[PDB]
Amino acid sequence: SATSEQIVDIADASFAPVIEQYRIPGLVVGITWQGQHSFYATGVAARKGNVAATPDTIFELGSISKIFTATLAALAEDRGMLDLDAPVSDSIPQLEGAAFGAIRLVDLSTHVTGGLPLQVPGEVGNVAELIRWLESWQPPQPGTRSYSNVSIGLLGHITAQTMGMSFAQAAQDVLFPAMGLGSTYVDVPDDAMDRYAFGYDRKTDAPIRVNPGVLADEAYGVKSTARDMLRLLDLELGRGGANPALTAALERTRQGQAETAYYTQDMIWEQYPWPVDVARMEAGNGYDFILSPQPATRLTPPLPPQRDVILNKTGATNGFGGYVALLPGQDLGIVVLANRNYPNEARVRATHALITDLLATQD
Amino acid sequence: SATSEQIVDIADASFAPVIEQYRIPGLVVGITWQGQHSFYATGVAARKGNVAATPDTIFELGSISKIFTATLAALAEDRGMLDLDAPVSDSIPQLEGAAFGAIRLVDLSTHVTGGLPLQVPGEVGNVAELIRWLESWQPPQPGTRSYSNVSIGLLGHITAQTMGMSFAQAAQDVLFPAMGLGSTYVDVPDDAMDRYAFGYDRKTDAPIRVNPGVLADEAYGVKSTARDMLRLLDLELGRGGANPALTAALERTRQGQAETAYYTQDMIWEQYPWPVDVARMEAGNGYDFILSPQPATRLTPPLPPQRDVILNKTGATNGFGGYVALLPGQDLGIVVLANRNYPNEARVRATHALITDLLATQ
């Protein structure tokens, strides 16, 4: 076996190239492996003040937030508050008879909607106006996976409405405490600001912050630390510590719901075999696969949570670039948080190399 | 004594030229005069479906929203919850010792702060981070009037916090009901969507909609109709039977707090003598008063609410251009709502001409 010091050494070497290539101001890697935690932290959370990045630095998760949204929906399902196999129109009755109303709730988390746009339309100013807009929407490519903030965001809206609170309240009062998190937020409070990293715009290098928007809380609203993300990954790896309802909810999100050209689509998580060629993970996380509708076939019943796979999710904002990976058969979870948005494919290549070199130590 | 029919015809004639000049898709004028509400409505609230604009069309008010923010602050003051003459640091203790903490609450509504950015900075993601940014702010032109969404927005946040609710809740559950409004919103609901106009971009003519933002609810978050805006103007005129507390709050906002080169700055309202040369109202509503700090001198104590004046406020978003004017000594209020952002001076010129023609029928 290898020391945690040797693990930190491998993380350092795996990400030195991308940090230089994309001028990443600060970067933190968390590793949980066979229940043991290691952290690599380098650079600065904030240039002004030259504040060092640490495992307790808060980063914007971007679309990694959607894992929390999906888990919240599965938690409501386990409590009998909704049925993810039911159509949207059971929750939003005015969409009865509309194509969007016929989508199963679960497919708001698989993105298998038939071509919904990535962003909330600019002519939509709140969720009520969005629902009206969806009354007349027709899927341009029925049956396809169409990666979007709109569908998963509306799943979070539906879920919070069922719980009788705002999405922020549901996440911060119910979900994050059940997960045992200590520095994860939808709304960062004053007492945590000292640790809240700034993101640095690619073109201008200016400090930039994710701003409010329609469905922003529900689709890209979470901020967290490498330390808290390892707590989540431990729960996903089945290390124990969550109540039975949360454990069931996590497991539900790791069921395989649909197959694409490159991976199995779970609830938000995207799942490859392990081992797998890195080029396939680069393609599946590739710009052109993500931005256009892609063929998908439904699994009915779903594939149970798998052992010898890698689950992953990318997440970014204008100022941040993050990545999470889960390898259940290797008892391994990795989170990589950076305060620079750098390409998905580069996050994948660097993390795949880290994983490969890490597992090679026990050869 | 002019009938509603001839008032409507005067409104029509007064705005036909500006509607053509700036290709305004829809425009509604509301007039309250001698207690009578009259409306001129023309064009469409939405080009798609040719949905007519009416006195019940909901428009984005932009900065005219700030009149509601200021009135809520004055209502909280009247209830004993706040003291508008007190420093910001009494409400936000971590700004003790900071230049921003020394600003009087009322000066968040007069804009006499010494220089703030117009918009919330991009490195600020919520009000908590905004307060942290303000800890290190220093005014670049001390004592000047600096029009800003930051200051008035923070007054709205402070007021709502003192009341123990969100600003949207304070506005929709307390203030709008107190004023008797029936179609005024910070968050437009489903049942009102059929009446919610679209705005039309100046450069692309595409429908556009105001989006969420830090302090957006507090600084530019209100949407309303001509019928409701005349109810507000009636309350400012001492009509509509407001209870004593709301009357006190409205009167507080109409006190003159500072003098600029062209007008008396009240709480958000900007006040000229009546009569007044239209060129003076054009200059005072120029974009230089938005973009650059302007000299201002404090009135201590404030000027009491005046009779022979015109109070006004411009309000816009990327898609909307609005204007309100109040003439207490003439028992007259006017609201002009449009789903095109057209220049301030044009709103002023057309409204001044409408007022002049109206009063001349006497």
Coordinates of N, CA, C and O in Angstrom, one line a residue, chain B residues 171-331:
Chain B
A171 N -43.7 43.4 0.4 CA -44.4 44.1 -0.6 C -45.8 43.6 -0.9 O -46.8 44.3 -0.8
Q172 N -45.8 42.2 -1.1 CA -47.1 41.6 -1.5 C -48.1 41.4 -0.4 O -49.3 41.4 -0.6
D173 N -47.6 41.1 0.8 CA -48.5 40.8 1.9 C -48.8 42.0 2.8 O -49.8 41.9 3.5
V174 N -48.0 43.0 2.8 CA -48.2 44.2 3.6 C -48.5 45.4 2.8 O -49.6 46.0 2.9
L175 N -47.6 45.8 2.0 CA -47.6 47.2 1.4 C -48.7 47.2 0.3 O -49.6 48.1 0.3
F176 N -48.7 46.3 -0.7 CA -49.7 46.4 -1.8 C -51.1 46.3 -1.2 O -52.0 47.0 -1.7
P177 N -51.4 45.4 -0.3 CA -52.7 45.3 0.3 C -53.1 46.6 1.0 O -54.2 47.1 0.9
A178 N -52.1 47.2 1.8 CA -52.4 48.5 2.4 C -52.8 49.5 1.4 O -53.6 50.4 1.7
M179 N -52.2 49.5 0.2 CA -52.5 50.5 -0.8 C -53.7 50.2 -1.6 O -54.1 50.9 -2.5
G180 N -54.3 49.0 -1.4 CA -55.4 48.6 -2.1 C -55.2 48.2 -3.5 O -56.1 48.3 -4.4
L181 N -54.0 47.7 -3.8 CA -53.7 47.3 -5.2 C -54.2 45.9 -5.4 O -54.3 45.1 -4.5
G182 N -54.5 45.6 -6.7 CA -55.1 44.3 -7.0 C -54.3 43.5 -8.1 O -54.6 42.4 -8.3
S183 N -53.4 44.2 -8.7 CA -52.6 43.5 -9.8 C -51.2 44.1 -9.8 O -50.6 44.3 -10.9
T184 N -50.6 44.2 -8.7 CA -49.2 44.7 -8.5 C -48.4 43.6 -7.8 O -48.9 43.0 -6.9
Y185 N -47.3 43.3 -8.4 CA -46.5 42.1 -8.0 C -45.0 42.3 -7.9 O -44.5 43.1 -8.7
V186 N -44.4 41.6 -7.0 CA -42.9 41.4 -7.2 C -42.7 40.1 -7.9 O -41.7 40.0 -8.6
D187 N -43.5 39.1 -7.7 CA -43.5 37.8 -8.4 C -44.8 37.6 -9.1 O -45.8 37.3 -8.5
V188 N -44.8 37.7 -10.4 CA -46.0 37.6 -11.2 C -46.5 36.2 -11.2 O -45.8 35.2 -11.5
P189 N -47.8 35.9 -10.7 CA -48.3 34.6 -10.6 C -49.0 34.1 -11.9 O -49.2 34.9 -12.8
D190 N -49.3 32.8 -11.9 CA -49.8 32.2 -13.1 C -51.1 32.9 -13.6 O -51.3 33.1 -14.8
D191 N -52.0 33.2 -12.6 CA -53.3 33.7 -13.0 C -53.2 35.1 -13.6 O -54.3 35.6 -14.1
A192 N -52.1 35.8 -13.5 CA -51.9 37.1 -14.1 C -51.1 37.1 -15.4 O -51.0 38.1 -16.1
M193 N -50.6 35.9 -15.8 CA -49.7 35.8 -17.0 C -50.4 36.3 -18.3 O -49.7 36.9 -19.1
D194 N -51.7 36.1 -18.5 CA -52.4 36.5 -19.7 C -52.3 38.0 -19.9 O -52.4 38.5 -21.0
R195 N -52.0 38.8 -18.8 CA -51.9 40.2 -18.9 C -50.5 40.8 -18.8 O -50.4 42.0 -18.8
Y196 N -49.5 40.0 -18.8 CA -48.1 40.4 -18.5 C -47.5 40.7 -19.9 O -47.2 39.8 -20.7
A197 N -47.3 42.0 -20.1 CA -46.7 42.4 -21.4 C -45.3 41.9 -21.5 O -44.6 41.7 -20.6
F198 N -44.9 41.8 -22.8 CA -43.5 41.5 -23.1 C -42.8 42.9 -23.4 O -43.5 43.8 -23.9
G199 N -41.6 43.0 -23.1 CA -40.8 44.1 -23.5 C -40.1 43.8 -24.8 O -39.9 42.7 -25.1
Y200 N -39.7 44.9 -25.5 CA -39.1 44.7 -26.9 C -37.8 45.4 -27.0 O -37.7 46.6 -26.9
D201 N -36.7 44.6 -27.3 CA -35.4 45.1 -27.2 C -35.2 46.2 -28.3 O -35.6 46.1 -29.4
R202 N -34.4 47.2 -27.9 CA -34.2 48.4 -28.8 C -33.5 48.0 -30.0 O -33.8 48.4 -31.1
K203 N -32.5 47.1 -29.9 CA -31.6 46.7 -31.0 C -32.1 45.6 -31.9 O -31.9 45.6 -33.1
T204 N -32.8 44.6 -31.3 CA -33.2 43.4 -32.0 C -34.7 43.2 -32.1 O -35.2 42.3 -32.8
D205 N -35.5 44.1 -31.5 CA -37.0 44.0 -31.5 C -37.5 42.7 -31.0 O -38.7 42.4 -31.2
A206 N -36.7 41.9 -30.3 CA -37.2 40.6 -29.8 C -37.8 40.8 -28.4 O -37.4 41.8 -27.6
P207 N -38.7 40.0 -28.0 CA -39.3 40.0 -26.7 C -38.3 39.7 -25.6 O -37.5 38.8 -25.7
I208 N -38.3 40.6 -24.6 CA -37.3 40.4 -23.5 C -38.0 40.6 -22.1 O -39.0 41.3 -22.0
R209 N -37.4 40.0 -21.1 CA -38.0 39.9 -19.8 C -37.0 40.2 -18.7 O -35.9 39.6 -18.8
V210 N -37.3 41.0 -17.7 CA -36.4 41.3 -16.7 C -36.0 40.0 -15.9 O -36.9 39.2 -15.6
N211 N -34.8 39.8 -15.6 CA -34.3 38.6 -15.0 C -33.9 38.8 -13.5 O -33.7 39.9 -13.1
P212 N -33.9 37.7 -12.8 CA -33.4 37.8 -11.4 C -32.0 38.3 -11.2 O -31.2 38.3 -12.2
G213 N -31.8 38.9 -10.1 CA -30.4 39.4 -9.8 C -30.3 39.8 -8.3 O -31.3 39.8 -7.6
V214 N -29.1 40.0 -7.9 CA -28.9 40.4 -6.5 C -29.6 41.8 -6.3 O -29.4 42.7 -7.0
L215 N -30.5 41.8 -5.3 CA -31.3 43.0 -4.9 C -32.2 43.4 -6.0 O -32.8 44.5 -6.0
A216 N -32.5 42.5 -7.0 CA -33.5 42.9 -8.0 C -34.9 43.1 -7.5 O -35.5 44.1 -7.9
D217 N -35.3 42.3 -6.6 CA -36.7 42.5 -6.0 C -36.8 43.9 -5.4 O -37.8 44.6 -5.5
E218 N -35.7 44.3 -4.7 CA -35.7 45.5 -3.9 C -35.5 46.8 -4.7 O -36.0 47.8 -4.3
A219 N -34.8 46.7 -5.8 CA -34.4 47.8 -6.6 C -35.2 48.0 -7.9 O -35.4 49.1 -8.3
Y220 N -35.7 46.9 -8.5 CA -36.4 47.0 -9.8 C -37.4 45.9 -10.0 O -37.6 45.4 -11.1
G221 N -38.0 45.4 -8.9 CA -38.7 44.2 -8.9 C -40.2 44.3 -9.0 O -40.9 43.2 -9.0
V222 N -40.8 45.5 -9.2 CA -42.2 45.6 -9.2 C -42.8 45.6 -10.6 O -42.2 46.3 -11.5
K223 N -43.9 45.0 -10.8 CA -44.7 45.0 -12.0 C -46.1 45.4 -11.7 O -46.7 44.9 -10.7
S224 N -46.7 46.3 -12.5 CA -48.0 46.8 -12.1 C -48.7 47.3 -13.4 O -48.2 47.2 -14.5
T225 N -50.0 47.8 -13.2 CA -50.9 48.2 -14.2 C -51.2 49.7 -14.1 O -51.0 50.3 -13.0
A226 N -51.7 50.3 -15.1 CA -52.1 51.7 -15.1 C -53.2 51.9 -14.0 O -53.2 52.9 -13.3
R227 N -54.1 50.9 -13.9 CA -55.2 51.1 -12.9 C -54.7 51.1 -11.5 O -55.1 51.9 -10.7
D228 N -53.7 50.2 -11.2 CA -53.1 50.2 -9.8 C -52.2 51.4 -9.6 O -52.1 52.0 -8.5
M229 N -51.5 51.9 -10.7 CA -50.6 53.0 -10.5 C -51.4 54.3 -10.2 O -50.9 55.2 -9.5
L230 N -52.6 54.4 -10.7 CA -53.4 55.5 -10.4 C -53.9 55.5 -8.9 O -54.1 56.5 -8.3
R231 N -54.2 54.2 -8.4 CA -54.5 54.1 -7.0 C -53.4 54.6 -6.2 O -53.6 55.3 -5.2
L232 N -52.1 54.3 -6.5 CA -51.0 54.8 -5.8 C -50.9 56.3 -5.8 O -50.8 57.0 -4.8
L233 N -51.1 56.9 -7.0 CA -51.0 58.3 -7.2 C -52.1 59.0 -6.4 O -51.9 60.0 -5.8
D234 N -53.3 58.4 -6.4 CA -54.4 58.9 -5.5 C -54.0 59.0 -4.1 O -54.4 59.9 -3.3
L235 N -53.3 57.9 -3.6 CA -52.9 57.9 -2.2 C -51.9 59.1 -1.9 O -52.0 59.7 -0.8
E236 N -51.0 59.4 -2.9 CA -50.1 60.4 -2.7 C -50.8 61.8 -2.7 O -50.3 62.7 -2.1
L237 N -51.9 61.9 -3.4 CA -52.8 63.1 -3.4 C -53.7 63.2 -2.2 O -54.4 64.2 -2.1
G238 N -53.7 62.3 -1.3 CA -54.6 62.3 -0.1 C -55.9 61.8 -0.4 O -56.8 62.0 0.4
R239 N -56.1 61.1 -1.5 CA -57.4 60.4 -1.9 C -57.2 58.9 -1.6 O -56.2 58.4 -1.2
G240 N -58.3 58.2 -1.7 CA -58.3 56.7 -1.5 C -58.3 56.3 -0.1 O -58.2 55.0 0.1
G241 N -58.5 57.1 0.9 CA -58.7 56.7 2.2 C -57.7 55.9 2.9 O -58.0 54.9 3.5
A242 N -56.4 56.2 2.8 CA -55.3 55.5 3.4 C -55.4 55.7 4.9 O -55.8 56.8 5.4
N243 N -55.1 54.7 5.7 CA -55.1 54.8 7.2 C -53.9 55.7 7.6 O -53.0 56.0 6.8
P244 N -53.9 56.2 8.8 CA -53.0 57.3 9.2 C -51.5 56.8 9.0 O -50.7 57.7 8.7
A245 N -51.2 55.6 9.2 CA -49.8 55.1 9.1 C -49.3 55.1 7.7 O -48.2 55.6 7.4
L246 N -50.1 54.7 6.8 CA -49.7 54.7 5.4 C -49.7 56.2 4.9 O -48.8 56.5 4.1
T247 N -50.6 57.0 5.3 CA -50.5 58.4 5.0 C -49.2 59.0 5.5 O -48.5 59.8 4.8
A248 N -48.8 58.7 6.7 CA -47.6 59.2 7.3 C -46.4 58.7 6.5 O -45.4 59.5 6.2
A249 N -46.4 57.5 6.0 CA -45.3 56.9 5.2 C -45.2 57.6 3.9 O -44.1 58.0 3.5
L250 N -46.3 57.8 3.2 CA -46.3 58.5 1.9 C -45.8 59.9 2.1 O -45.0 60.4 1.3
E251 N -46.3 60.6 3.1 CA -45.8 62.0 3.3 C -44.4 62.1 3.6 O -43.7 62.9 3.1
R252 N -43.8 61.1 4.4 CA -42.4 61.1 4.7 C -41.6 61.0 3.4 O -40.6 61.7 3.2
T253 N -42.0 60.2 2.4 CA -41.3 60.0 1.2 C -41.3 61.3 0.3 O -40.4 61.5 -0.5
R254 N -42.3 62.2 0.5 CA -42.4 63.4 -0.2 C -41.7 64.6 0.4 O -41.8 65.7 -0.1
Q255 N -41.0 64.4 1.6 CA -40.2 65.4 2.2 C -39.0 65.7 1.3 O -38.4 64.7 0.8
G256 N -38.6 66.9 1.1 CA -37.4 67.2 0.4 C -36.1 67.1 1.2 O -36.0 67.7 2.3
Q257 N -35.2 66.2 0.8 CA -34.1 65.8 1.6 C -32.8 66.5 1.2 O -31.9 66.8 2.0
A258 N -32.7 66.8 -0.1 CA -31.4 67.4 -0.6 C -31.8 68.2 -1.9 O -32.8 67.9 -2.5
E259 N -31.0 69.2 -2.3 CA -31.2 69.9 -3.5 C -30.1 69.6 -4.5 O -28.9 69.5 -4.1
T260 N -30.4 69.4 -5.7 CA -29.5 69.2 -6.8 C -29.5 70.5 -7.7 O -30.3 71.4 -7.4
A261 N -28.8 70.4 -8.8 CA -28.8 71.6 -9.7 C -30.1 71.8 -10.3 O -30.4 73.0 -10.8
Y262 N -31.0 70.8 -10.4 CA -32.3 71.0 -11.1 C -33.5 70.7 -10.3 O -34.6 71.1 -10.7
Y263 N -33.4 70.0 -9.2 CA -34.6 69.6 -8.5 C -34.3 69.3 -7.0 O -33.2 69.4 -6.6
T264 N -35.4 69.1 -6.3 CA -35.3 68.7 -4.9 C -35.4 67.2 -4.9 O -36.4 66.6 -5.4
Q265 N -34.4 66.5 -4.2 CA -34.4 65.1 -4.1 C -35.2 64.7 -2.8 O -34.8 65.1 -1.7
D266 N -36.3 64.0 -3.0 CA -37.1 63.4 -1.9 C -36.6 62.0 -1.7 O -35.5 61.6 -2.1
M267 N -37.4 61.1 -1.1 CA -37.1 59.7 -1.0 C -37.5 59.1 -2.4 O -38.7 58.9 -2.6
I268 N -36.5 58.9 -3.3 CA -36.7 58.4 -4.7 C -37.4 59.5 -5.5 O -36.8 59.8 -6.6
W269 N -38.6 60.0 -5.2 CA -39.2 61.0 -6.0 C -38.2 62.2 -6.2 O -37.5 62.6 -5.2
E270 N -38.3 62.8 -7.3 CA -37.5 64.0 -7.7 C -38.5 65.1 -8.0 O -39.5 64.9 -8.8
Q271 N -38.3 66.3 -7.5 CA -39.4 67.3 -7.3 C -38.9 68.7 -7.9 O -37.9 69.2 -7.5
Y272 N -39.8 69.2 -8.7 CA -39.6 70.5 -9.4 C -40.7 71.5 -9.0 O -41.8 71.0 -8.6
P273 N -40.5 72.8 -9.0 CA -41.7 73.7 -9.0 C -42.7 73.3 -10.1 O -42.3 72.8 -11.1
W274 N -43.9 73.7 -9.8 CA -44.9 73.8 -10.9 C -45.5 75.2 -10.9 O -46.0 75.6 -9.8
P275 N -45.5 75.9 -12.0 CA -45.0 75.5 -13.3 C -43.5 75.4 -13.4 O -42.9 76.0 -12.5
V276 N -43.0 74.8 -14.4 CA -41.6 74.7 -14.6 C -41.3 74.5 -16.1 O -42.1 73.9 -16.8
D277 N -40.2 75.1 -16.6 CA -39.8 74.9 -18.0 C -39.5 73.5 -18.3 O -38.8 72.8 -17.5
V278 N -40.0 73.0 -19.4 CA -39.8 71.5 -19.7 C -38.4 71.2 -19.8 O -37.9 70.2 -19.5
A279 N -37.6 72.2 -20.4 CA -36.1 71.9 -20.6 C -35.5 71.6 -19.2 O -34.5 70.9 -19.2
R280 N -36.0 72.2 -18.1 CA -35.4 71.9 -16.8 C -35.6 70.5 -16.4 O -34.8 69.8 -15.8
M281 N -36.8 70.0 -16.6 CA -37.2 68.6 -16.3 C -36.4 67.7 -17.2 O -36.0 66.6 -16.8
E282 N -36.2 68.1 -18.5 CA -35.4 67.2 -19.3 C -33.9 67.1 -18.8 O -33.3 66.0 -18.8
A283 N -33.3 68.3 -18.4 CA -32.0 68.2 -17.9 C -31.8 67.4 -16.6 O -30.9 66.6 -16.5
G284 N -32.8 67.6 -15.7 CA -32.7 66.8 -14.5 C -32.9 65.3 -14.7 O -32.5 64.5 -13.8
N285 N -33.6 64.9 -15.7 CA -33.8 63.5 -16.0 C -32.8 63.0 -17.1 O -33.0 61.9 -17.6
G286 N -31.7 63.8 -17.3 CA -30.7 63.3 -18.2 C -29.9 62.1 -17.7 O -29.9 61.9 -16.5
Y287 N -29.3 61.4 -18.6 CA -28.6 60.2 -18.2 C -27.3 60.6 -17.5 O -26.7 59.7 -16.8
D288 N -26.8 61.8 -17.6 CA -25.7 62.2 -16.8 C -26.0 62.1 -15.3 O -25.0 61.9 -14.5
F289 N -27.2 62.2 -14.9 CA -27.6 62.1 -13.4 C -27.5 60.6 -13.0 O -27.4 60.3 -11.8
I290 N -27.6 59.7 -14.0 CA -27.4 58.3 -13.7 C -25.9 57.9 -13.7 O -25.5 57.2 -12.8
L291 N -25.2 58.3 -14.7 CA -23.9 57.8 -15.0 C -22.7 58.5 -14.2 O -21.7 57.9 -14.1
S292 N -23.0 59.7 -13.7 CA -21.9 60.4 -13.0 C -22.4 61.0 -11.7 O -23.6 61.3 -11.6
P293 N -21.5 61.1 -10.6 CA -22.0 61.7 -9.4 C -22.3 63.2 -9.6 O -21.6 63.9 -10.4
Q294 N -23.3 63.7 -8.9 CA -23.7 65.1 -9.1 C -23.7 65.8 -7.7 O -24.0 65.2 -6.7
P295 N -23.4 67.1 -7.7 CA -23.4 67.8 -6.4 C -24.8 67.8 -5.8 O -25.8 68.0 -6.6
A296 N -24.9 67.7 -4.5 CA -26.2 67.8 -3.8 C -25.9 68.5 -2.4 O -24.9 68.3 -1.8
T297 N -26.9 69.2 -2.0 CA -26.8 69.8 -0.6 C -28.0 69.4 0.2 O -29.1 69.4 -0.2
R298 N -27.6 69.0 1.4 CA -28.7 68.5 2.4 C -29.5 69.6 2.9 O -29.1 70.7 3.2
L299 N -30.8 69.3 3.0 CA -31.8 70.1 3.8 C -32.0 69.5 5.1 O -32.2 68.3 5.3
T300 N -31.7 70.3 6.2 CA -31.8 69.9 7.6 C -32.5 71.0 8.4 O -31.9 72.0 8.6
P301 N -33.7 70.8 8.9 CA -34.6 69.7 8.6 C -35.1 69.6 7.2 O -35.0 70.6 6.4
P302 N -35.7 68.5 6.8 CA -36.3 68.4 5.4 C -37.3 69.4 5.1 O -38.0 69.9 6.0
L303 N -37.5 69.7 3.8 CA -38.6 70.5 3.3 C -39.9 69.7 3.5 O -40.0 68.5 3.0
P304 N -41.0 70.2 4.1 CA -42.2 69.4 4.2 C -42.8 69.1 2.8 O -42.5 69.8 1.8
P305 N -43.7 68.1 2.7 CA -44.3 67.9 1.4 C -45.0 69.1 0.9 O -45.7 69.8 1.5
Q306 N -44.7 69.4 -0.4 CA -45.0 70.7 -1.0 C -46.3 70.6 -1.8 O -46.7 69.5 -2.2
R307 N -46.9 71.7 -2.0 CA -48.2 71.8 -2.8 C -47.9 72.1 -4.3 O -48.3 71.3 -5.1
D308 N -47.3 73.2 -4.6 CA -47.2 73.6 -6.0 C -45.9 73.2 -6.6 O -45.1 73.9 -7.0
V309 N -45.8 71.8 -6.8 CA -44.7 71.1 -7.3 C -45.1 70.1 -8.3 O -46.3 69.7 -8.3
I310 N -44.2 69.5 -9.0 CA -44.4 68.3 -9.7 C -43.3 67.3 -9.3 O -42.1 67.6 -9.3
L311 N -43.7 66.2 -8.8 CA -42.8 65.0 -8.4 C -42.8 64.1 -9.6 O -43.9 63.8 -10.2
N312 N -41.6 63.5 -9.9 CA -41.6 62.5 -11.0 C -40.6 61.4 -10.7 O -39.8 61.6 -9.8
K313 N -40.7 60.4 -11.4 CA -39.7 59.3 -11.5 C -39.8 58.6 -12.8 O -40.9 58.2 -13.2
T314 N -38.6 58.4 -13.4 CA -38.4 57.5 -14.5 C -38.1 56.1 -14.1 O -37.5 55.9 -13.0
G315 N -38.6 55.1 -14.9 CA -38.3 53.7 -14.6 C -38.2 52.9 -15.8 O -39.1 53.0 -16.7
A316 N -37.1 52.1 -16.0 CA -37.0 51.3 -17.2 C -36.3 50.0 -16.9 O -35.7 49.8 -15.8
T317 N -36.5 49.1 -17.8 CA -35.7 47.9 -17.9 C -35.2 47.8 -19.4 O -35.5 48.7 -20.2
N318 N -34.5 46.7 -19.7 CA -34.1 46.6 -21.1 C -35.3 46.7 -22.1 O -35.1 47.1 -23.2
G319 N -36.5 46.2 -21.6 CA -37.6 46.1 -22.5 C -38.8 47.1 -22.3 O -39.7 47.2 -23.1
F320 N -38.7 47.9 -21.2 CA -39.8 48.8 -20.8 C -39.3 50.2 -20.5 O -38.1 50.4 -20.1
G321 N -40.1 51.2 -20.7 CA -39.9 52.6 -20.4 C -41.1 53.2 -19.7 O -42.2 53.3 -20.4
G322 N -41.0 53.6 -18.5 CA -42.1 54.1 -17.7 C -41.8 55.5 -17.1 O -40.7 55.9 -16.9
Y323 N -42.9 56.2 -16.7 CA -42.8 57.5 -16.1 C -44.0 57.7 -15.2 O -45.1 57.4 -15.6
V324 N -43.8 58.4 -14.1 CA -44.9 58.8 -13.2 C -44.6 60.3 -12.9 O -43.5 60.7 -12.6
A325 N -45.7 61.0 -12.8 CA -45.7 62.4 -12.4 C -46.9 62.7 -11.5 O -48.0 62.2 -11.7
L326 N -46.6 63.5 -10.5 CA -47.6 63.8 -9.4 C -47.6 65.3 -9.2 O -46.5 65.9 -9.0
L327 N -48.8 66.0 -9.3 CA -48.9 67.4 -9.1 C -49.9 67.7 -8.0 O -51.1 67.8 -8.2
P328 N -49.4 67.8 -6.7 CA -50.4 67.8 -5.6 C -51.3 69.0 -5.7 O -52.5 68.9 -5.4
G329 N -50.8 70.2 -6.0 CA -51.6 71.4 -6.1 C -52.6 71.5 -7.2 O -53.4 72.3 -7.2
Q330 N -52.4 70.5 -8.2 CA -53.4 70.4 -9.3 C -54.3 69.2 -9.1 O -55.1 68.9 -10.0
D331 N -54.1 68.4 -8.0 CA -54.9 67.2 -7.8 C -54.8 66.3 -9.0 O -55.8 65.7 -9.5

